[PDB]
């Protein structure tokens, strides 16, 4: 039965916290006898990806995930999603996914709202070639693929963005609006610009593949250097 | 009180239960009944609930 | 919400022009300028602007049925102690009025000397008409040992 | 600043006192005009200390 | 032995906090020379001290 | 050489030479948030990831059951023109937006602010208050109780209701167990020490100190309430 | 003798015997209850230093920096000149274009450098000054430049000496803001001139926070030992009472600390002569007593 | 058979097996053994020392290490000398103790308190007619510290 | 009881007049443990407040006993009979 | 500025001690030392009580001075005068020595009164240049010094 | 407030997603953006 | 010597002076020692004497009880609280001793 | 049948609104499913308790009371 499942997965990891707990007490008990101080150093004790119990993140081996990131609780990304350095996706309370090809941002935050109005998803969905500029905001909002959010955007619950659609940077996406396909839009309160052209199209395209390529240029220095977990 | 109408029979009712306004979080609408006695969330018998996005993005992994 | 007069699209008002200037005299005779708002206790503006002079044992009293209350209930315990005496010049001090029968028990029950114009910070609440109010700040009495703590 | 508690340091020179607190002007006299009196300056401390005894 | 999977079985970090009078002649173990001398030191500069109160107490006991 | 290691010399908790932190009962610092100087948390309040917090330059005092949210700068100024205290003040149940950065200003209790705000020094948001993501509030200026503004400079927009006020309150009374979630995924022992390797100095001493007292003294009785506790 | 002895030798036998029995047990335990807790758990790492980070022959230069948070993030072609300031959060992706930082700049915490071009280098002046959450993107930014809380400079920006941008200004892709002006809104507007007084609380402002800079610098670059120490020292604080600082004090100052030594006290409280007036104080325009000035009351 | 013999190492722990939870006799009340000296002075209870008294010191001795340690646990801004020297007087005040329960074990032997070795010719042996420890006892494992006639 | 026992109706009648006093002399102070918010009492040791597991955990004995102590008090009862016994009064 | 946790250790010890004293303890019933001092089993359950409550006590003391230190040793070697002294009232068998351990006792609690902090290293830094008046302590010694007077001639 | 889920998986709720529709074009620059739901 | 209804003022100050271990040290002493000897004066060591001893106790908690009864209610600290408590308990276990007395 | 990601499929060939459209029920599903979990993980915390201490908190009340 699945719940019975449930209770002896929780039992084991109860007694598995149990037998670290003693332990790590031991190994304090025996520096104090010992005279030894290595116990007493603090030492960060941040970790990229955090499980809630149950909750895993979960990503392709391909994607290049900053050490100065964290995931936390229901994160998935795609094949070759790049996190930026000192963004986190808390994804605590609901589920964030991202697509294959997405790029984020240095010092994105991404978190979702408790709870919302009925046919509302409460979870981040991300499209395929999406690029999130630096220090953008998002909370519980859908973007489809080949979208590009400039820097310091804010986006809010509900909010969805249809494929192609482009949004200047230092503008807000209110909460529980739509953003049409092929349109920029700008401003505090996003207003209507333009209608996207091939060029700029293009253009965005070849940006986000050119992150795409900074972030695996970032992963194997950073292997080089000893700052990235071969996982 | 002729407008009133906080179900959808007479005036449509949003399943989004507002048009959020800009500089507004968006929130539900306090409802009517305000009653606490509510089980937790029911799911249908036998249903599937495993982890397959997980279970997929790992099995591709190895 | 209220108590103000902005219309959709407005600035927000300046702070130096909403701040209640209270003029002192300390303990040691020199003179001090400190501001304060409308709503908050006169012992709240001092401990804020941290004037020396006020002990302040039981740190304000109750938290309902509080002296600063404009009806005051009757049910009331009044202040829990006489260690924010305050002498506050004659203009305003007309102002305030008569005492409260438990602010005035506890100010006679004070066991340094009282001055007529004696009241508790406490049981003084900000008005805008007390722009510019002069009071004198004296040293207050220490009543327990947890005072120097 | 080092060993001084909340009392800060500032662009000409460091307070003698934690930052909202009241400046004191006889302080200020002994520090700045240290075991000099050109006269016996009858400040209100002094004149209240007088009618106290 | 020196490395596991995470853990270093062999971490150690020397505690650099030690009490001054460590390795001092008076904490020698009683009854060796060293001791000896340390006490003996201790006993005259405490008879310098207080020789009324050495006599009362010593030589009455 | 100066900056050449491997292993971060961060600490989430600082103290510059008489300026210790305080935190409550049950309030969560993340390992990747900085709160360093003169700053006093309180009970409940939980501090996201990589939210500074100095109190160096002037004291910061936090209420109860707030939020602080992500990439959040708060900070504070040498002075006021006023003359008033440039101490950072927050009252209970506030939250404060991602992206935010918030100067020496007084905030109320039950005061909402967006993502991505700048709230500049001299402020004061009375209590109940709301502030758009994206908007400025400018040096001394006073934001009623109650009351919604928004844009840069911010701009008064409606009067907020008591509905409106109960679900800020609610949504700050929510962010506790996520803070309680997230809390007890650390033990109270730390095991980052056991994964580095033995130095010369760790094995030899290069100068000795008297035993004076241990930090950790009374810490087999002392609970471990907080994980993150050194 | 007996007493003693057998002290001693508990002693060495506990801690050449229990002290690594119950150290290997410990470790073995808390392997064990890691791998009883996998999946559903995360352990302490080793954080990497991203201060320095090298990425395809391009090596930061920042050695010649006064303070360089701990936890701030330092790739590819990144300069500093002498005094320098990098706060917390700060990430500067030197990779992308040159980053050039001037003498004496600060750049506070959660500041992020990006150049939006593919190779478009971020040359910062000397004196300058960038706030918290600040943006810039790709500009020339001269001397004695000022850059206020989350405000964001856009690529392709030119901003002279002493110019100022308002926190909170978002200044337009491709703008020139001429010296002595102020900045403000989003888009960026000029609003006015700077002001004397303004410009010297600037001044002061960007004074105080170098200073403050070397404070941060010296509390954050310490060792474990000296870290430990501070711990232990701020616990003696939080007991030590009125007598045992006043003692403190004493001996800072060289006061006699051992009774054979108080036969010689005068010679270090009262014999020492007091240092000579500078005779800069014999120079000051007016000698009155010191009083508060009553203006406004 | 229920107590242990007064001249082994183990005679000592005789002092924990209680007939009855008293602490003392009334005045009238015969020993539970023969008396060998009931004027019994400081020499002659010295000169009955015995073995089971040594067991005593000994055990004293052995449990004053880990006691006094427990004890030193509490120390702070201590030098070493002074450690050793607050175990030392630690240590002996224990074994001093130890000594006056050997005294007192020897002088409880000297007056029949405690099992000597000798017994009365006629006991005199009571009625339980109250008993509510008889069953628990015998089906526990405090049978061992009472003696039953 | 015991009052009751030896027959004093008097000291009953001034036995529950100091009872009542100073029953609502201990149950006035519950009005003043109302609190506008939650209080800060704990002493900060390592920028955390100290919160004393031993404590706690006399507290919980005691707070068992307090609440249940007319279960288990016919033992104390029976105890404290037995220790005045001697007393030969 | 040496914690007494140990001086409040090496108290519960040797309570610990004569408690295990008394458990093992045996005699007539009857007065020893001139008939100055009764030994009974009321006076000797009197005795054992006090040492068991005042071991608890001193066991909660320890716990709390862990926590924080605002006490000196003299306070705990106070105590331990009168904890060691006071459970002997119980075995007084006349009036004359029950005054004496009363007066000793009192003498304690004195000592005890004496050596209670007086100056606290709080975050008041608004007094350094002024002169407060404190009584307290002044009347804590007063009072307790002639309600002694009083009793003792009484 | 109220805490539970909106989408119940017993049963799709009943909707119309014609009464109200979402404008795509011939936007103005003055103009809010439009809604994302507008089922009924 | 103990600080009973009739002379409690000055126990009053006493604990006010006190610090909380030295009440918390001093109520045990006090509750454990000294009123329990007070109290087997009556009961047990000078019992041929409760012919004169039972007016006087009495007299004393009727004085007590209508001294405290205004007074209990006038105090405003922590410290005088803990002190009436004790002064409170004091005159009820004075009572019961008259009962038992008697 | 099968397991199919429709956030990492691709919907290039859809319209933006049928993409959106299918998106939010994917997410929709997948979040039902994770509600169902985390309930599931929630009760089994709420069952182990009572199964293990049911009996001694019973055992201790029936001693204590008879
Ligand atoms: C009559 C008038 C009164 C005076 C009489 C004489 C009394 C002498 C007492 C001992 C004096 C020791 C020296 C004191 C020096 C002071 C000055 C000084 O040094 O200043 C610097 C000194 C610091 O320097 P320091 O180096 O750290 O310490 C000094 C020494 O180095 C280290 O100091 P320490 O104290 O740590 O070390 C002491 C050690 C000094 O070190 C040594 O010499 C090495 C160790 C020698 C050990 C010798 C042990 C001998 C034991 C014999 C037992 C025989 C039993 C036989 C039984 C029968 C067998 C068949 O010497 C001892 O151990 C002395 C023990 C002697 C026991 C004799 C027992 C006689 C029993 C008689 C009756 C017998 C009846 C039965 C007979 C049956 C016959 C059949 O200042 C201090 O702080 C010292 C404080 C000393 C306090 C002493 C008093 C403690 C108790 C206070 C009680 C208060 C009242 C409450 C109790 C009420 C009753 C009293
Ligand atoms: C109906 C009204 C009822 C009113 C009741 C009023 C009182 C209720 C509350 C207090 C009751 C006593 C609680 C236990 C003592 C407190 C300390 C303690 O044990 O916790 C620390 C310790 C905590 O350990 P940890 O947290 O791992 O480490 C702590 C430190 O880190 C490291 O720890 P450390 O190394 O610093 O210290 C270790 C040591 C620390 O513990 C101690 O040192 C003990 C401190 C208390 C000493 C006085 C105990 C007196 C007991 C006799 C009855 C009177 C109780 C009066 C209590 C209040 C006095 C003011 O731990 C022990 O060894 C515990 C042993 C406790 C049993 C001692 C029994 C002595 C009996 C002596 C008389 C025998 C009869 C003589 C007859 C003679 C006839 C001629 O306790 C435990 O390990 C177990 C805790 C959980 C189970 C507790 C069970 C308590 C049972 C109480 C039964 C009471 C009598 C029966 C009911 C009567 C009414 C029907
Ligand atoms: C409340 C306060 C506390 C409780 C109340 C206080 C009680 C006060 C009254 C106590 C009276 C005790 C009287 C005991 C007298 C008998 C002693 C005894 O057993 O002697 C047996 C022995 C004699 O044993 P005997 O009696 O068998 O010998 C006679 C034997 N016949 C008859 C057969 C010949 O006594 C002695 O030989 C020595 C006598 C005393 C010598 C002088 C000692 C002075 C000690 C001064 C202090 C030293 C401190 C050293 C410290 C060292 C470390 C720092
Ligand atoms: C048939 C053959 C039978 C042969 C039997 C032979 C053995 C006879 C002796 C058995 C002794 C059993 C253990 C006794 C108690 C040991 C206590 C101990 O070591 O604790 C150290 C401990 C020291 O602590 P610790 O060593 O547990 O560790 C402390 C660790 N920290 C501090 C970190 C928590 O002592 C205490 O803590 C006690 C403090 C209060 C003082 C209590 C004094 C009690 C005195 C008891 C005397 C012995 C009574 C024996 C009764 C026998 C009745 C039959
Ligand atoms: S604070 Fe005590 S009366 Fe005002």
Known sequence: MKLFQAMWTRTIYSIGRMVRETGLALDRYGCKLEQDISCYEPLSRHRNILPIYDLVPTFYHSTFIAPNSSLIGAVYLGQNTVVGYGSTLRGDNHAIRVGHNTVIGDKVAI???????????????????????????????????????????????????????????????????????????????VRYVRDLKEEEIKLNLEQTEQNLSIGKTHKSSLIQQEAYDRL | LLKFDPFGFYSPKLLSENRPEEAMPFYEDYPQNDSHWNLWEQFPEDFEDSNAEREAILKSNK | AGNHHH??????????????????????????????????????????????????????????????????????????????????????????????????????????????????????????????????????????????? | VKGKGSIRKGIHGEGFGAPSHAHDALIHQIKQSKDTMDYQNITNEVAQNFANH | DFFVDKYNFSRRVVDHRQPYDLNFSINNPVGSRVWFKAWKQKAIGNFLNLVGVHYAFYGAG | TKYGENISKHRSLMSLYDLHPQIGYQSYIAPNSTVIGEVTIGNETTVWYNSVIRGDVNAVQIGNNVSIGENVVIHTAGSLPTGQPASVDIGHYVIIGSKSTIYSCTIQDEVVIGQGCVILEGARIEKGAMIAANSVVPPGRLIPAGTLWAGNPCTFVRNLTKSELATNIDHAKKQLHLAQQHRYEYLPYNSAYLQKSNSEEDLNPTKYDDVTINYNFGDEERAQENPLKY | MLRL?????????????????????????????????????????????????????????????????????????????????????????????????????????????????????????????????????????????????????????????????????????????????????????????????????????????????????????????????????????????????????????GFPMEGEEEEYIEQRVFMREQLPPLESEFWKKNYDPYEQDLFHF | ?????????????????????????????????????????????????????????????????????????????????????????????????????????????LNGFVDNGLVWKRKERKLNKYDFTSEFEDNSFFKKLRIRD | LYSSFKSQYLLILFMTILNIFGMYFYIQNLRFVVKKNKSSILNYKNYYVNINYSITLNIILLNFFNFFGILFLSDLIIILNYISSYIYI | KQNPSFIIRLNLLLNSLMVLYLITFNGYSSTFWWSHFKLNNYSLYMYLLVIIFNNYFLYITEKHIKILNNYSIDYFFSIINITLFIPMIFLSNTLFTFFFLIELVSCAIFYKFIVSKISFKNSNYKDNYFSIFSKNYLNVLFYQYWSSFFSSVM | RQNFAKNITTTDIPKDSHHFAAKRSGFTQTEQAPFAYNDV | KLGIAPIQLYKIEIYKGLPFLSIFFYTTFYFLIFFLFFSLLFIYYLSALNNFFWIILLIISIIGIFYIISIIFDINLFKAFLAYSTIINSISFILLIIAIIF | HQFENVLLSNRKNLTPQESVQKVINYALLQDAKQRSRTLRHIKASWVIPALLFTYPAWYLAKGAVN
């Not at chain 7, 790709?138 to 001397?143: F, V």
């Not at chain 7, 609380?201 to 030992?225: G, M, P």
Request: aromatic letters at 8%.
């Open chain 3, 7 to 149: 219309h959709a699209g407005d600035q927000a008002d300046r702070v130096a022009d909403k701040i209640i200037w209270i003029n002192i005299q300390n303990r040691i005779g020199q003179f001090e300028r400190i501001s304060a708002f409308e709503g908050e206790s006169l012992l709240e503006a001092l401990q804020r602007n941290k004037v020396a002079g006020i002990v302040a044992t039981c740190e304000g009293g109750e938290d309902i049925n509080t002296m600063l209350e404009k009806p005051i209930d009757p049910v009331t315990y009044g202040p829990f102690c006489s260690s924010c005496q305050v002498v506050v010049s004659n203009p305003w001090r007309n102002k305030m009025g008569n005492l409260h029968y438990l602010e005035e028990r506890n100010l006679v029950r004070s066991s340094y000397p009282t001055t007529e114009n004696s009241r508790l910070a406490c049981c003084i609440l900000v008005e805008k008409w007390m722009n510019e109010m002069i009071i004198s700040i004296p040293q207050n009495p220490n009543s327990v040992y947890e005072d120097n703590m």
């Open chain 1, 111 to 189: 978190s979702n709202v408790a709870t919302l109005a009925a046919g509302i998803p409460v979870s981040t969905n991300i499209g395929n070639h999406v690029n999130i500029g630096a220090g953008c905001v998002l909370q519980s909002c859908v973007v489809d693929d080949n979208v590009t959010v400039g820097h310091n955007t804010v986006i809010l619950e509900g909010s969805v963005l249809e494929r192609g659609s482009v949004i200047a940077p230092n503008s807000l996406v209110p909460a529980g609006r739509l953003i049409p396909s092929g349109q920029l839009w700008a401003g505090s309160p």
């Open chain 7, 5 to 253: 002895r057998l002290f001693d030798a508990y002693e060495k036998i506990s801690m050449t015997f229990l002290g690594p029995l119950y150290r290997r047990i410990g470790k073995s335990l808390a392997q064990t209850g890691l791998n009883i807790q996998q999946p559903y758990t995360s352990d302490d790492r080793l954080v990497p230093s991203l201060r320095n980070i090298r990425v395809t022959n391009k090596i930061p230069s920042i050695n010649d920096s006064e303070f360089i948070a701990p936890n701030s993030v330092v790739i590819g072609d990144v300069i500093t000149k002498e005094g320098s300031s990098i706060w917390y959060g700060a990430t500067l992706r030197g990779e992308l274009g040159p980053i050039e930082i001037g003498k004496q700049t600060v750049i506070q915490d959660l500041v992020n450098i990006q150049s939006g071009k593919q190779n478009q280098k971020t040359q910062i002046g000397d004196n300058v000054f960038i706030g918290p959450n600040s943006y810039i993107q790709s500009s020339k930014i001269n001397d004695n430049s000022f850059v206020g809380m989350g405000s964001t400079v856009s690529t392709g920006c030119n901003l002279a000496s002493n110019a100022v941008v308002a926190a909170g200004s978002v200044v337009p892709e491709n703008t020139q803001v001429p010296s002595n002006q102020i900045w403000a809104g989003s888009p960026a507007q000029y609003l006015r001139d700077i002001t004397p007084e303004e410009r010297q609380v600037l001044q002061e402002h960007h004074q105080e926070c170098v200073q403050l800079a070397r404070i941060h610098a010296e509390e954050t670059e310490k060792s474990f030992r000296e870290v430990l120490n501070d711990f232990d020292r701020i616990t003696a604080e939080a007991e030590y009472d009125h007598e045992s600082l006043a003692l403190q004090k004493m001996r800072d100052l």
């Open chain 8, 1 to 109: 058979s229920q107590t242990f013999a007064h001249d082994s190492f183990l005679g000592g722990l005789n002092l924990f097996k209680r007939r009855d939870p008293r602490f003392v006799l009334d005045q009238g009340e015969r020993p539970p053994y023969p008396i060998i000296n009931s004027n019994s002075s400081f020499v002659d209870v010295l000169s009955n020392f015995n073995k089971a008294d040594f067991g005593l010191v000994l055990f004293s001795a052995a449990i004053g290490f880990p006691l006094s340690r427990w004890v030193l646990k509490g120390l702070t801004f201590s030098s070493l000398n002074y450690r050793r020297g607050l175990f030392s007087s630690v240590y002996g005040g224990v074994i001093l103790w130890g000594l006056v329960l050997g005294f007192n074990n020897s002088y409880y032997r």
